[PDB]
DNA sequence: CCCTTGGCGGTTAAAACGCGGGGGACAGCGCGTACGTGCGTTTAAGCGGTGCTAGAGCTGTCTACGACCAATTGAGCGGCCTCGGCACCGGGATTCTGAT
DNA sequence: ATCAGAATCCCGGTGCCGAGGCCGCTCAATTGGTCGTAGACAGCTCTAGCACCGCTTAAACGCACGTACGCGCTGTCCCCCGCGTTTTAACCG
């Protein structure tokens, strides 16, 4: 929330939080790491 | 069945006849965006800009295949090879 | 905001050469970029010729020599002919 | 990924327009490499003109000035 | 007196005044003569008249009364001198002249 | 008639890089034509950038972008670094 | 007060004043900023310093203490970036880099 | 005074030496005349540009600067002569 | 028997020799008379400075050297060590000069 | 006024002309494998439609900044002198090519 | 795998004409002041650009199969190279 909201690449601020509260695994690199 | 090489010629006349764009929009646009990510992040593209890169790219590749065809035919072969491409790009001074 | 172009002029010349033939908007854009291109070429060559000979004024002579440099062969000959005729009729009347 | 999104039939068609009759199997990777090169060369310039104007949008005029910048002039999109 | 346009004096359809303005504000030289916009506008009129003439002939040959970029591609590349002038130009939606090397044809 | 050149300046820079090495007159002429060439290139690109963006003043930003266009890669990076340092020290003191 | 040269302020060996004059009278733009001659002169100093550095290295490799056009030809063409910048340039008395295609050598 | 057959003044050993510098190992006997034609075309271009510059300046002498502006005009920059 | 080199060795030694030096490979007076003849067809009674003729010699010789480099690339691409006219006109066709 | 053109005479490196012969251009032939061609199966492209909002685009002040002219002077340049790094040469040692 | 021998590198010596420093002599670079104005900054509008999904279907993909041609090999012949001799036009003054 604070780190990825601090990234501010684009349109994510709305897209980032809906996903991470639902799934972390929707992101490919995150699920890979 | 047609003898091999006839369908290729009919395609030559067909595509040389029309103005149609030979590369699909969305893949080329995603490619342009990927290549542009390495320069400045979070960029906006107008549709006419992507269309411009598609025009210049397709025309450049068409000319490159013309000169490559000239090289292959100069080698007494009807099949273009990578050494023909890189030869043409070596003679043009692009490398 | 008013963005001017050469569209109506290419249209008039087209109606002089081929009165019965129309032109698409895209072809009109190509003609516009063509006129701007050639214009910038002749003006640039005129600037170079004016700078090398150490003169601060662009006259019809520098434009003439620039046309003779840029346009190959018959385009240069007929172009210089038409232009010289135009300046002739211009200053005569 | 993306550059693979340029398809064997696509490059095949681009060669059919150029006059090529028969194509070797190795033309495709080289064509993708060349395309990536050219696109990097044009896009770095277009992004340069974009950053100079202090704009976040890459317009058509930036690409036209990049192509004219590299010696290949384009008409119909403005200039 | 009633103002008469300088384009109408020389018999030119192109805006001699606009060309003069572009020469003044184009940072070309410090001063611009009185014959430069007339002569230059005339040259542009000749070139435009020629390319539109060939484009009209190609359009008439293709049974189309509206000029399209394809007709500009054909009209230019089929002419030798305009091909020498525009050789570095890429025309949008132009296409390629139909061509096949004689060795590639069956026999 | 006094025809100025960059000769003495290329000479000074040469004595900075290689104090023990001299330069022939012909090589000095080549260096002169090189400096004039690159100068006309950067100035021309600066004029184009100033005209396209509709500004009548050439500043350090247009020269910077012109350097980034003309010089490939490391020449552009180190060139912009040295120039930015020079303007920095210039306006600072 | 005693006049101090602007070239000495920024620490540049090149004539910032002369570059400023050439930008003013070069018909480039209508007005010239105060940072353009300094920045441009610095860029020219970097380029000249590099090409003279490679030229000096080549001269030292050839056991000659005086730089000749051959040393400029070698110093440029042996470097990739300067070859990309000068690729369209023909240097007088330059010569050609020694080169032989490996297929032409006996075996 | 009409000058003719001066392009034949270019000698077979000359062009041979140019090819020896260019990296050519063995030369075919038909290279020569073609090379003379190409050289003549190039000189026609560069000389028509330079003579055009000289005509514009109302001068009877072709300066090296005119040749440099013709080569740079064609896209080939020649350093060292001005 | 008189000692003779195998064909192709003298050619390579000449390659190294001429690629080693800066010498001009075309004789002055013939090239100058050629330039004057070509210039006769444009404007009669022209004067040439020596540095101008030297300039045309530099540009001409360098242009022909590059042309023979690319021509050599074509001939070698054809799996032949002997350049042919079709290699020349091929290179001039790919460069866009014709 | 100085750099181009023209002429003349003596030297000699270079070009023309010829002549063997060996190696490479070129035609033919055969093999194997790689690419064209068609068909069934997926699959994202194309088109549409929704929801949001970032930044393009224009305006209105307002001010630092560059053009412009007068005064002044020192950095750079043309003319003018040294002197030494490099062209040129002559001899010797070394290396690379070719027939045993 | 090796000597004969022709070409090349190396070294010592010599002569010279261009590189390098000096010295008047400017005239353009620097300073000091003004004066108008381009653009820097803040504000406002609203358009096109961004993401996403629904839904259809033309195109791509995988595969089976045939045969056209690329490439390796061989033989032939012809033509361009290496060298000697003779002439001439470049070159230099």
UniProtKB/Swiss-Prot annotation, chain A:
Top-level taxon: Eukaryota
Compartments reported by the entry: Nucleus
Transmembrane regions listed in the UniProt entry: none
Description of how the protein assembles with itself and partners: Component of the SWI/SNF global transcription activator complex. The 1.14 MDa SWI/SNF complex is composed of 11 different subunits: one copy each of SWI1, SNF2/SWI2, SNF5, SNF12/SWP73, ARP7/SWP61, ARP9/SWP59; two copies each of SWI3, SNF6, SNF11, SWP82; and three copies of TAF14/SWP29.
Protein role: Involved in transcriptional activation. Catalytic component of the SWI/SNF complex, an ATP-dependent chromatin-remodeling complex, which is required for the positive and negative regulation of gene expression of a large number of genes. It changes chromatin structure by altering DNA-histone contacts within a nucleosome, leading eventually to a change in nucleosome position, thus facilitating or repressing binding of gene-specific transcription factors.
Extra remark beyond the main annotation: Present with 217 molecules/cell in log phase SD medium.
UniProt-recorded name of the protein: Transcription regulatory protein SNF2
Species of provenance: Saccharomyces cerevisiae (strain ATCC 204508 / S288c) (Baker's yeast)
Residues of the full protein shown: 1023 to 1071 of 1703
Curated annotation (Swiss-Prot), chains C, F:
Domain of life: Eukaryota
Main localization (coarse): nucleus
Cysteine-cysteine disulfides: none
Glycosylation sites: 81
Keywords associated with the record: Acetylation, Chromosome, DNA-binding, Glycoprotein, Isopeptide bond, Nucleosome core, Nucleus, Phosphoprotein, Ubl conjugation
This protein's record includes keyword Acetylation: yes
Subcellular localization: Nucleus; Chromosome
PTM characteristics: Monoubiquitination of Lys-89 by BRE1 gives a specific tag for epigenetic transcriptional activation and is also prerequisite for histone H3 'Lys-4' and 'Lys-79' methylation.
UniProt similarity note: Belongs to the histone H2B family.
Subunit structure: The nucleosome is a histone octamer containing two molecules each of H2A, H2B, H3 and H4 assembled in one H3-H4 heterotetramer and two H2A-H2B heterodimers. The octamer wraps approximately 147 bp of DNA.
Name of the protein described by the UniProt record: Histone H2B 1.1
Organism: Xenopus laevis (African clawed frog)
Span of the entire protein shown here: 33 to 125 of 126
Curated annotation (Swiss-Prot), chain D:
Sequence positions bearing N6-acetyllysine: 8, 36, 56, 68
Residues found modified as Phosphotyrosine: 28, 65
Modified residues (N6-(2-hydroxyisobutyryl)lysine): 8, 21, 36, 54, 56, 68
Keyword Electron transport in annotation: no
Single GO MF descriptor: DNA binding
Modified-residue entries (N6-butyryllysine), positions: 8, 21, 54, 56, 68
Tree of life domain: Eukaryota
Localisation per UniProt entry: Nucleus; Chromosome
Per UniProt, location of the Glycyl lysine isopeptide (Lys-Gly) (interchain with G-Cter in ubiquitin) cross-link in this chain: 68
Keywords on record: Acetylation, Chromosome, Citrullination, DNA-binding, Hydroxylation, Isopeptide bond, Methylation, Nucleosome core, Nucleus, Phosphoprotein, Ubl conjugation
Modified-residue entries (Phosphoserine), positions: 24
Residues with the N6-lactoyllysine modification: 8, 54, 68
Chain positions with N6-succinyllysine modification: 8, 54, 68
Position(s), cross-link Glycyl lysine isopeptide (Lys-Gly) (interchain with G-Cter in UFM1): 8
Subunit structure as annotated in this protein's UniProt entry: The nucleosome is a histone octamer containing two molecules each of H2A, H2B, H3 and H4 assembled in one H3-H4 heterotetramer and two H2A-H2B heterodimers. The octamer wraps approximately 147 bp of DNA.
Post-translational modification N6-glutaryllysine, affected residues: 8, 36, 54, 56, 68
Protein name: Histone H4
Protein's job: Core component of nucleosome. Nucleosomes wrap and compact DNA into chromatin, limiting DNA accessibility to the cellular machineries which require DNA as a template. Histones thereby play a central role in transcription regulation, DNA repair, DNA replication and chromosomal stability. DNA accessibility is regulated via a complex set of post-translational modifications of histones, also called histone code, and nucleosome remodeling.
Family: Belongs to the histone H4 family.
Residues annotated with N6-propionyllysine modification: 8, 21, 54, 56, 68
GO cellular component entries: nucleosome; nucleus
Species of the source: Xenopus laevis
Post-translational modification: Demethylation is performed by JMJD6.
Keyword Nucleotide-binding: no
A single GO BP: nucleosome assembly
Swiss-Prot record, chains E, G:
GO cellular component, one term: nucleosome
Intracellular or extracellular location(s): Nucleus; Chromosome
GO biological process, one term: heterochromatin formation
This protein's record includes keyword RNA-binding: no
UniProt modified residues of type N5-methylglutamine: 93
Keyword set, alphabetical order: Acetylation, Chromosome, DNA-binding, Hydroxylation, Isopeptide bond, Methylation, Nucleosome core, Nucleus, Phosphoprotein, Ubl conjugation
Covalent cross-link Glycyl lysine isopeptide (Lys-Gly) (interchain with G-Cter in ubiquitin), where: 2, 4
Quaternary context: The nucleosome is a histone octamer containing two molecules each of H2A, H2B, H3 and H4 assembled in one H3-H4 heterotetramer and two H2A-H2B heterodimers. The octamer wraps approximately 147 bp of DNA.
Family from the record: Belongs to the histone H2A family.
Protein name per its UniProtKB record: Histone H2A type 1
């Amino acid at each position: 929330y604070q780190q990825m909201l601090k990234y501010r690449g684009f349109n994510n601020q709305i897209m980032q939080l809906k996903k991470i509260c639902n799934h972390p695994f929707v992101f490919e690199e995150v699920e890979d790491q | 069945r047609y003898r091999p090489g006839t369908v290729a010629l009919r395609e030559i006349r067909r595509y040389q006849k029309s103005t149609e764009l030979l590369i699909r929009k969305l893949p080329f646009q995603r490619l342009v965006r990927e290549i542009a990510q390495d320069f400045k992040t979070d960029l906006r593209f107008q549709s006419s800009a992507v269309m411009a890169l598609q025009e210049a790219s397709e025309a450049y590749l068409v000319a490159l295949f013309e000169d490559t065809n000239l090289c292959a035919i100069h080698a007494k072969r009807v099949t273009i090879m990578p050494k023909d491409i890189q030869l043409a790009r070596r003679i043009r001074g692009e490398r | 905001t008013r963005k001017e172009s050469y569209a109506i002029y290419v249209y008039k010349v087209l109606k002089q050469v081929h009165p019965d033939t129309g032109i698409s908007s895209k072809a009109m854009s190509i003609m516009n970029s063509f006129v701007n291109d050639v214009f910038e070429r002749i003006a640039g060559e005129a600037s170079r010729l004016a700078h090398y000979n150490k003169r601060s004024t662009i006259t019809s002579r520098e434009i003439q020599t620039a046309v003779r440099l840029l346009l190959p062969g018959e385009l240069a000959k007929h172009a210089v002919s038409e232009g010289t005729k135009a300046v002739t009729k211009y200053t005569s009347a | 990924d993306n550059i693979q999104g340029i398809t064997k039939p696509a490059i095949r068609r681009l060669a059919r327009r150029g006059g090529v009759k028969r194509i070797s199997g190795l033309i495709y990777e080289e064509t993708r490499g060349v395309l990536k090169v050219f696109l990097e060369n044009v896009i770095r310039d277009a992004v340069t003109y974009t950053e100079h104007a202090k704009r976040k949008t890459v317009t058509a005029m930036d690409v036209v000035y990049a192509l004219k910048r590299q010696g290949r002039t384009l008409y119909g999109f403005g200039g | 007196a009633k103002a008469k346009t300088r384009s109408s004096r020389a018999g030119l359809q192109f805006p001699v005044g606009r060309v003069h303005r572009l020469l003044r504000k184009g940072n070309y030289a410090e001063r611009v003569g009185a014959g430069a916009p007339v002569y230059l506008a005339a040259v542009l009129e000749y070139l435009t008249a020629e390319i539109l003439e060939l484009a009209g002939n190609a359009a008439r040959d293709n049974k189309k009364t509206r000029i399209i970029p394809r007709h500009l591609q054909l009209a230019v590349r089929n002419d030798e001198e305009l091909n020498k002038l525009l050789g570095r130009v890429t025309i949008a939606q132009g296409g390629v002249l139909p061509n096949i090397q004689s060795v590639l044809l069956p026999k």
